[PDB]
Every structure is written in C-alpha cells, then in structure tokens.
Symmetry: D2
Subunit: 116 residues, 4 copies
C-alpha cells in the first residue's frame, strides 16, 4: 500500500475495528470526487485502498465514520467524523499512513509520509 | 457566548491569531445555512459568535481556516481547512468550546461541553 | 497567574474538577524543591499557583493527580499520575498554560507560552 | 514482542528515528526499577524490549527522551520527555503498544492492548 489508514480507540485501548473509511480526491471542478472506501480490520488497519499507479499527486480527504462506531458501542459522541486533508506526491511517489486516535469528544489525526 | 473557538499552534506553543472561523447550521431542507463567523483574537479565541436566544438545538458545522495565520509566519505553503460537525443543545442549553491544535502533519480537536 | 493548569476529560467532554496539582522547582543541588500546589476548580483550571515575583527562571515540574476526579465518577480503578518537566522564563518572563486531556488509555498534554 | 513502542514526529510527518526509550517497572519498595531501553529504528519502532516470560504483571513507566531528539534537529522543545504509565497483565498475557505523537510543545501517548 501507498495508502494506509489506522484507527485507535482511546476509551478501550484497542484498535478501532470495522470503522467505515471514505477517501475523496479533489477534482478539477474543485469538488470532492470519491476515490476509495473500506472498513478497518481486527488490527484497526485499512490497506488496499489504492495502487501506486492510481494514487497520483493531488489533494485528498480521508473521512472516518466515527459516529456509527461510537453508537455501535452505546456512546453518543460529539463528532460526526474524523477528517484529515493532505496533499499527496508533490515530490513524487511515497508511502502514506493516516493514523487516527478517537475518543467520544476528541480526536487526532496524523499523516506519516515515508520514502521506501 | 455559548459557543467559543480556541486555536493553538503545537510547534510554536502559541495561540493562533486571525484564524477565520465560519459556523453553519443544518436547515429543514438539509442545506447548510450560514450561522456565524469571526476571527480569532490575540489569545487564539473567538467569542461573541452567538447568543443563547439564537443558539437553538440543531446540527452545526464549525470550519476553521488557518491561511492568514500561516501566511504571516512566512509559512505560505502549509495551511489548514478543518471542520467539525456536531449536535448542539439536544438535552437543553450547553456552553460549547471547540479547541483545535495545529501542526504541519497533525491535527487534534477537542470539545468541551458544560452546563451553567 | 503566570502559571496555569487546565485538565479536561476526553470521554465526557468535561473539565476535570478537583485534580490535585503539585509544582516543583529544581534547586542548586539538583533536588526538586516544592514550589506550589492546588486543586482544579469547576472549570478544570487552577490559577493562583504563583506570582511573577516568585516565578523566576528555572526548571519546573508539574504533577497532576486525577484520583479524586475518577473516584467521584465511580471509576475507582483507573486514575492518572502525569508529570511535565520544563524550563521557564529562560528568555525573560512568560505566561505558561499547561493543558492535559485525559482518557482511559491515552493522555495528551500541551503547553501554551505567551508574552504580555 | 509483547511490548512495542512507536514514535511519530508531527512536524516532519515521519516516524521519529533514533529516539532513546527507557522502560521502568515499579518495584516492591515502591521505586522505579529499570526494565529495558532502546532506540527507535528507521520506522520509528522499538521491538525486542522484553520477552513474554520477563514482562510480568505490574506498573510500568515508558520514558521517551524527546528533548535530545528535538535538539538534534535544531529545535528547543518544551518537554524533557514524553512519559506514559500503564498497568500490565492484570488479566494475564497481552501484546502492548505504546504509541507516541510528538511536537515541540505537545505530545500524546496511547497504550494499545491486543489479545492474540
Ligand atoms: Cu460519513
Ligand atoms: Cu428551510
Ligand atoms: Cu484555503
Ligand atoms: Cu540548594
Ligand atoms: Cu495515586
Ligand atoms: Cu531521560
């Protein structure tokens, strides 16, 4: 993968399992175009979103559907989503990991960029 | 001020001054109606977005735009568009503080909800 | 108050009330001398730890103890001992705010340094 | 590994490479006893700190030497360390990952516990 998402749950101290993730890419008309989506695995990871050939230079939006996650567990959270926007491949091809840490009233997101 | 926004820069341990903030409210037809807007002061806060008379039950979006903040540091390239969507006053009136913590590859946001 | 502590609970999106805070200052012999202590108020803040006359250049430790906070929620088991160590006023006097964000398996802390 | 540490740099959007990590275990006399230490790899990970047989029930302290890290890069940070305290194996044997996100004025730490 050049693009991985990883989601952690701060309440339970576990990976967030089975969370919906939607990735969008900013188009020429200046809207968000759907790019990929998936659900996190037992380990809280989502691999296989794209190929290197399909993950070109651009602006991407990762949208994690955290409200459904917290409601599945009986908790009414604050946010609808955890979002993060990043700019890809301005200097060509790279591994990208979007790490997200969730709690009912707070979250953080991080983009890690690695040249293998 | 039942609604307040505070923005901080985690590299420089400073308030983020002149961050544009826009707030929207979901209408009956499911479009986003404009609700309030402002800039963060010297202490990174924005108060006076609304009154309790106008801040009714609903679904609200707060968008922060950090462009002016970065530009004036002489960091033109990186800047942030961040958004939270939440449900307000569903169990009666509350004071909301939306706090955001910025960094070049990471973003955190937290919400503090009290009852006076 | 050139030194302030703010504690927030990220599960409940609330201030943490009655958190004991202790502050220490490194002495000439490299032992930690007691400097100040207090409890967080209703809004999760502690002010009045010191004056600018007493808050001189030095290396300071701030310890937060969340036991009373958890106990009163009926969460006895989990509680936190957290500590930050930092250098204060090295380039002249500054106001410091040490903010902490608690959760069962995660902890965040941030420092905001301004110059009045 | 039943114990891994993972450190990320929020400024550069990379793993934190070559950071010193010290792990302590709380002893019977109620002091911190040294348990293990190591440096993060190219990927920001430290594996091999212990065996399952040696990582028994107890209270552990992970101390990341972040000040040296930031100074290596030319930045005068706020904190001396990123710390985290956790309780291990109260319910027997588990994989533990201590994830840390660093910036010069803020950090977060998370303990992830997984039953393989
Ligand atoms: Cu959605
Ligand atoms: Cu309408
Ligand atoms: Cu813009
Ligand atoms: Cu002395
Ligand atoms: Cu204690
Ligand atoms: Cu050390």
């Amino acid at each position: 993968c050049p693009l991985m998402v990883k989601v952690l749950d701060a309440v339970r101290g576990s990976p967030a399992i089975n969370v919906a993730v939607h990735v969008f890419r900013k188009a020429a008309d200046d809207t968000w175009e759907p790019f990929a989506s998936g659900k996190t695995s037992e380990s809280g990871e989502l691999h296989g979103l794209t190929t290197e050939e399909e993950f070109v230079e651009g602006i991407y939006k990762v949208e994690i559907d955290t409200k459904s996650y917290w409601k599945a567990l009986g908790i009414s959270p604050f946010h609808e989503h955890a979002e993060v926007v990043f700019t890809a491949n301005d200097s060509g091809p790279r591994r990208y990991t979007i790490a997200a840490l969730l709690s009912p009233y707070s979250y953080s997101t991080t983009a890690v960029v690695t040249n293998p």
